[PDB]
Amino acid sequence: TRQGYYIRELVDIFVVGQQCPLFEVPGPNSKRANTHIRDFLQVFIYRLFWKSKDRPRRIRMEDIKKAFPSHSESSIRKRLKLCAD
């Protein structure tokens, strides 16, 4: 860590074979894929509103632009259009 080194011994190590997947990975730019994208952004926006101390709760746009910098700001505006002004 930042403060120093720490040492443990280990005695047990597992080898994991070939995985049998139980969850389907979406494809690039698929409906489910981009749905998760806008949902991840909406959840982050709600949790930034919960963390806000001023009443009424207010956030800044460039916090979201620091978190999601590949997003066009039209999509972030779209998420903030409902629930904020």
Next chain:
DNA sequence: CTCACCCAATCGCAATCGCCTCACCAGAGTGACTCACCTTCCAGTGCCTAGTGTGGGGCTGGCTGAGTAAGGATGTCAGACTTCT
């Protein structure tokens, strides 16, 4: 001037179809076996040649009669004699 919203365009994903390929099923042909029919051979039975019994239909000798006749072989006696008792 800057920001936000709306519209348009492009890309990606999903669904449907699309025509070609593969697989399965069915039918036909091929090969062998079995069965049936025909043909041939053999065997048996039923009549033609050969070898024959038994007989028809002729055919010719034999038959007392009494007379004329011979030697005739055959024999029935008849006697004389030699053997046995």
